[PDB]
Design a protein around this ligand. Structure first.
Ligand SMILES: O=c1ccn([C@@H]2O[C@H](COP(=O)(O)OP(=O)(O)O)[C@@H](O)[C@H]2O)c(=O)[nH]1
Length: 405
């Protein structure tokens, strides 16, 4: 089949969609991977032996005054600037005509699109190509949904879609997946957990962060990362910083800077000085796969993005969960329900947190002998499912057979 994949302008979407693209190409299916030029330049290089079977289609974002040149992703357009977020959404909506023009001449058997791509689902109807809507989250997340705005956009894409795609399996969610066959009438297929193929991401294993981990003792480092886009204000960064200090663990912290915050104001006064030997803060893109693979990393303080949840658990790491928005909350609950993680206490009404809640979560998961060994033993039990690569390939084989019918 010639499958056209158009992921949402977010590395949380672009990365797993490129893994999918390559898993399809490995079965000898042609993929057209449709996105913007800079997002594509920033992706892992394709496996050379699959290079002709993953065609990249670079649709330039229309230049919307106010959205600066290169601001093509959620990683580039900050959430703490709502104005720019909307300019990014409008520019993304400007890809409609060029996407329609492309799909016309594509000879496409399927179009797989994200929930934001109402205009791509429209082009699929225009050119009589069956359109699968990606909801590459937990079965629990989809159950939670089932129970122009983004909701209008979701409703509109879903109505024009023949199929809904989830990223889980009965092995990981026996309670949800069996009874979850449709979403507002549209049939749901789960393509497995699709854990990343480590080689696949083509990260730098000589990165300073990984060399730093080599020096640390086994299962001793709390990796801290909130994925690629979720906002965290300077005040909240400070609470997370002081929380990491108070718990007293070795930490590696992949931190994105809030907008308009100097390197001087970003962290608490003397924070790096006081933690020099024990902790490392990186305000750049880190090789997350290499870090989580490392024997020095014990627990993972995550925002519970589904990619990060799956990456964390495939290397048997118990989770310290700080969900910010969207799928994160339900993803946190599901892991908490499986006793392989603990949520940071949150003030009800505002969803805020403090250094004390942060510290108590880290202690319970990573420090206190009895609680930590429970969380580790349970993360390891989940690892048996999440890292069963053969299982998740059989689910990709299953998903292809679904597309043929
Ligand atoms: O410094 C970083 C930040 C993010 N990621 C990757 O970006 C993806 C983020 O996806 P997730 O759903 O976990 O969070 P999102 O960015 O979608 O909120 C994951 O695959 C991470 O491994 C990374 O490799 N290094």
């Amino acid at each position: 089949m010639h499958v056209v994949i158009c992921p949402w302008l977010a590395f949380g979407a672009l990365l797993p969609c490129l893994d999918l693209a390559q898993r399809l190409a490995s079965r000898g299916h042609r993929v057209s991977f449709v996105s913007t030029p800079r997002n594509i330049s920033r992706l892992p290089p394709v496996r050379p032996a699959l290079a002709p079977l993953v065609a990249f289609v670079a649709l330039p974002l229309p230049r919307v005054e106010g959205l600066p040149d290169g601001a093509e992703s959620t990683n580039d357009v900050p959430h703490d600037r709502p104005d720019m977020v909307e300019l990014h959404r409008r520019a993304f909506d400007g890809l409609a005509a060029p996407f329609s023009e492309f799909l016309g001449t594509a000879c496409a058997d399927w179009v797989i699109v994200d929930v934001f791509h109402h205009w791509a689902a429209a082009a699929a109807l225009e050119h009589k190509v069956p359109c699968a809507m990606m909801l590459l989250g937990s079965a629990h997340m989809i159950a939670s949904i089932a129970d122009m705005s983004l909701a209008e956009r979701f409703s509109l894409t879903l109505s024009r879609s023949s199929l809904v795609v989830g990223r889980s399996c009965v092995e990981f969610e026996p309670e949800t997946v069996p009874l979850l066959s449709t979403l507002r009438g549209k049939p749901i297929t789960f393509l497995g957990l699709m854990p990343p193929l480590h080689e696949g991401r083509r990260e730098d294993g000589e990165d300073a962060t990984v060399r730093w981990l080599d020096a640390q003792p086994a299962k001793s480092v709390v990796y801290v990362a909130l994925g690629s886009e979720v906002p965290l204000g300077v005040e909240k960064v400070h609470e997370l910083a002081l929380g990491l200090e108070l718990a007293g663990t070795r930490f590696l912290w992949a931190l994105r800077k809030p907008t308009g915050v100097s390197d001087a104001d970003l962290l608490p006064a003397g924070f790096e000085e006081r933690t020099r030997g024990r902790g490392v803060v990186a305000t750049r893109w880190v090789p997350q796969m290499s870090i989580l693979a490392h024997a020095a990393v014990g627990a993972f303080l995550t925002h519970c993005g589904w990619n990060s949840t799956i990456e964390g658990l495939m290397f048997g790491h118990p989770l310290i969960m700080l969900p910010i928005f969207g799928d994160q909350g339900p993803n946190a609950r599901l892991i908490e329900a499986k006793n392989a993680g603990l949520q940071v206490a949150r003030n009800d009404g505002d969803g805020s947190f403090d250094r004390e809640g942060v510290a108590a979560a880290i202690r319970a998961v990573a420090v206190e002998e009895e609680s930590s060994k429970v969380f580790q033993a349970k993360a390891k039990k989940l690892q048996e499912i999440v890292a069963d690569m053969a299982c998740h390939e059989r689910y990709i084989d299953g998903f292809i057979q679904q597309l043929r019918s």
